[PDB]
């Protein structure tokens, strides 16, 4: 499913991302924009044998199970296919885990494009 910007902002808020660990809603929307372009089915095979999944491109080396990433962990306790759902619930729960175990600095495109900007722009008119 490709979300619209406001549609995704709306769903992130009700999952409680707004001010999660002190990051305002617009940060997470800006992250997902540069990670997947709002497409839940974005998939990216990495050179180490892992894959990135979902709207925030979560990796199978550490976080989810795809049954094809050798020596990988499943720190979020989820199948990586749940990260491909039109239901963003599993991707939100995994993201929250990442922010705490690591914060948003894990998402390099967010660090370079989003962090320290007027990120509440991502939220205008929602």
């Amino acid at each position: 499913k490709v979300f619209g910007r406001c549609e995704l902002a709306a769903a992130m808020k009700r999952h409680g991302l707004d001010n999660y660990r002190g990051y305002s809603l617009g940060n997470w929307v800006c992250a997902a924009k540069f990670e997947s372009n709002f497409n839940t089915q974005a998939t990216n095979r990495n050179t180490d044998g892992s894959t990135d999944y979902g709207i925030l491109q979560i990796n199978s080396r550490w976080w989810c199970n795809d049954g094809r990433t050798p020596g990988s962990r499943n720190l979020c306790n989820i199948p990586c296919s749940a990260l491909l759902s039109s239901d963003i619930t599993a991707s939100v729960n995994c993201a929250k885990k990442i922010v705490s175990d690591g914060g948003m600095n894990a998402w390099v495109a967010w660090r370079n494009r989003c962090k320290g900007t007027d990120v509440q722009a991502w939220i205008r008119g929602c």
């Binding site: 491109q57 894990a106 390099v108």
Partner: protein, 167 residues
């Protein structure tokens, strides 16, 4: 011959999540993949991997490593992936990655890197000189190795903000 504590299959030896304090004895010298992650290893013996010259992958992450023996990885010239994240490491011994001519991926984050001390300089330089080898919890990220306290990138640390008196 599999070590008692571990699981084996072809050339992979999984010693992971077994509450180990050190590397088990009897890893076949033909081993290509060694999982030691999620244990409580605090110190490695010098030379512990010198016989495992065929290793292409080594996971040491998620232990309690405080210090690495010098030359711990010197014989591992086929290693493509090394994981060292989520330990108690303060620095990397000078030259410790120099023989890793097959390296494609290393994880360094969630360590208390001590950027006040002059021992951090080999690591700072090494990361700067290998901008495509370091990975964070997601993708490629040379800044993911971060100084304890200040949370700035190790690769940014230069000789003038360090001191030999702080080691």
């Amino acid at each position: 011959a599999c070590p008692s504590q571990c699981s084996c299959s072809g050339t992979t030896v999984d010693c992971s999540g077994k509450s180990l304090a050190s590397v088990p004895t009897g890893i076949p010298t033909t081993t290509q993949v060694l999982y030691l992650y999620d244990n409580q290893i605090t110190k490695l013996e010098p030379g512990v991997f010198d016989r495992l010259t065929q290793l292409t992958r080594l996971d040491l992450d998620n232990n309690q490593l405080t210090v690495l023996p010098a030359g711990v990885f010197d014989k591992l010239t086929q290693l493509t992936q090394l994981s060292l994240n989520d330990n108690q490491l303060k620095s990397i011994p000078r030259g410790a990655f120099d023989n890793l001519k097959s390296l494609t991926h290393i994880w360094l984050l969630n360590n208390p890197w001590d950027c006040a001390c002059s021992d951090i300089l080999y690591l700072s330089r090494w990361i700067s000189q290998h901008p495509g080898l370091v990975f964070g919890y997601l993708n490629l990220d040379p800044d993911s190795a971060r100084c304890s306290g200040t949370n700035t990138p190790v690769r940014a640390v230069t000789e003038a903000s360090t001191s030999p008196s702080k080691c």
